[PDB]
Amino acid sequence: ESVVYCDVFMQAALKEATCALEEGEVPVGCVLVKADSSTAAQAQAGDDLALQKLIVARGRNATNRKGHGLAHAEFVAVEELLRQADLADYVLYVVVEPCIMCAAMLLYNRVRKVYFGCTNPRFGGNGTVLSVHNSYKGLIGYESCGGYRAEEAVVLLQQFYRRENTNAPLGKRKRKD
Amino acid sequence: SMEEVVVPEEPPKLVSALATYVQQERLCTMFLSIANKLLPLKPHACHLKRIRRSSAVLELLLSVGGPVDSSALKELESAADTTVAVHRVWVPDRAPRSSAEEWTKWCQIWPFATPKPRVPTQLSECEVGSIQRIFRTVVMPLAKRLRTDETLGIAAVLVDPSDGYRVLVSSGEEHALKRGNSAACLGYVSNSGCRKSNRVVLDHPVTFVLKEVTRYLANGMDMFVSHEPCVMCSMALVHSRVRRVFYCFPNPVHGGLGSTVSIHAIQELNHHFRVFRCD
RNA sequence: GGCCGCUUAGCACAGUGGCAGUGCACCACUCUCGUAAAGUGGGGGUCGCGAGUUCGAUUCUCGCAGUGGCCUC
Ligand SMILES: [Zn+2]
Ligand SMILES: [Zn+2]
């Protein structure tokens, strides 16, 4: 066996950003699927109920309501995975490339592989700056592929600032037309 | 003893260039426009100033990073109505942006078009004493009581400078990292990949603190932090803004302020912040 | 009283006989982890002030107005 991208998992990941977009949180969604479930046999879209029930943990960018400015999607679902119960060998599929924070946390937990659809230059852990295989020990590392469904991953994120903020200082907020 | 942490850089070198001598001012005033029209400065060669006076007398530089153009020099001679002699000079190939002392260090040969770099404030005399008091009061005593052999020994504190450097929140015993676990120990202690991880660690003693002040994001506070934050706590300090970071004993195995990569200096990131060592 | 320095846009500070500048900013604009950030461009000035010198003075020359350091009372 091995791990390959499965379409329905990324569909769930991207449809897990629209719900957070309606809430008004930044549209970044992560889906932790079972380690031995990303196998080619599950590549097809068949058995949608079974495929979306094999999903182990899902998270969104819960920073707006929480108040913790340091809690992206990756840091939430792992908590959910911890709450439902380990060395996080489960594969993680996210819509935007993990930030340096998430790329460090996943390194510390020995993640088997972390796929992402879009690359965010301002805060990118596997893009501009590379924590994919940076740590040198003595054998601690993970991998990450280029991008899948990037167009949706950027449309949802652009639809965020087109609508304005709410909590903001009257002087510091932007009254864009 | 505060040692400011700055991105290392190499001293500039010199590449050949061609100059000349100018006697009268009006000819040079016309020559400025003539050279601007004929030989505009290259983008890599725009970091210099054409105006120059000889040490002994005015001598003017003409061509940067290479020989003069034949037609351009002939037109310059025609404008001067006299022959133009060329003496070789040298011009810098590396542009400094952080040190005023380094900026002046090569000013003897030639000035820089980019002005004196904005010198960061060199703290103050009393704030050093405040830092010493906080070290002898809070962070260092925790690193004393936090570690028996079992807990790691890292403590971080969110100090507020406006109120006389008072501790807003301090990480305690129930926040630190176990030695046996290897998930938390990759960043701070060496060879943590040898042992398996019993648990999953999501928060280090620098992220527990930053999530207890929400009661914007810690913008404008300060963080005394004993051992130097890892790469995760670097984004803790960069998404949740922080004015200054004071690490005492650096982490060679992995660290976002020291060994691995100086996160605070990364250009694409929004919030650039300063880091001071304090041993 | 004396002596030394200093005055430049809303602000903070360069700079020099011939173009009047640079950081913060009243503001505007562009984007992929709120766009409450960061990059980017525009406008903003009696260079105490007067007299003199110079084809030409913020600069040079003198005086005067102001502040600051030391000294004298
Ligand atoms: Zn992240
Ligand atoms: Zn850390």
Author numbering:
A (entry chain 2): 19 to 103, 123 to 175, 183 to 221
B (entry chain 3): 0 to 55, 105 to 263, 277 to 340
What does the literature reporting this entry say, word for word?
I34 formation is essential for viability and catalyzed by adenosine deaminases acting on tRNA (ADATs). In eukaryotes, the essential enzyme catalyzing I34 formation in tRNA is a heterodimer, composed by one active (ADAT2) and one inactive (ADAT3) paralogous subunits, both homologs of the bacterial enzyme. These ADATs carry a characteristic cytidine deaminase (CDA) active-site amino acid signature motif (C/H)XEXnPCXXC (with X being any amino acid, and n being any number of residues), containing the active-site acidic glutamate (inert valine in inactive subunit ADAT3) and cysteine/histidine residues coordinating a Zn2+ cation. To resolve this dilemma, a single tRNA (tRNAArgACG) in bacteria and 7–8 different tRNAs (depending on the organism) with an encoded A34 in eukaryotes (i.e. tRNAThrAGU, tRNAAlaAGC, tRNAProAGG, tRNASerAGA, tRNALeuAAG, tRNAIleAAU, tRNAValAAC, and tRNAArgACG) are post-transcriptionally modified to inosine (I34). This A34 to I34 tRNA deamination leads to the greatest enhancement in decoding capacity that can be caused by a single modification, as the INN anticodon can base pair with three different codon triplets at the mRNA, namely NNC (cytosine-ending), NNU (uracil-ending) and to a lesser extent NNA (adenosine-ending).
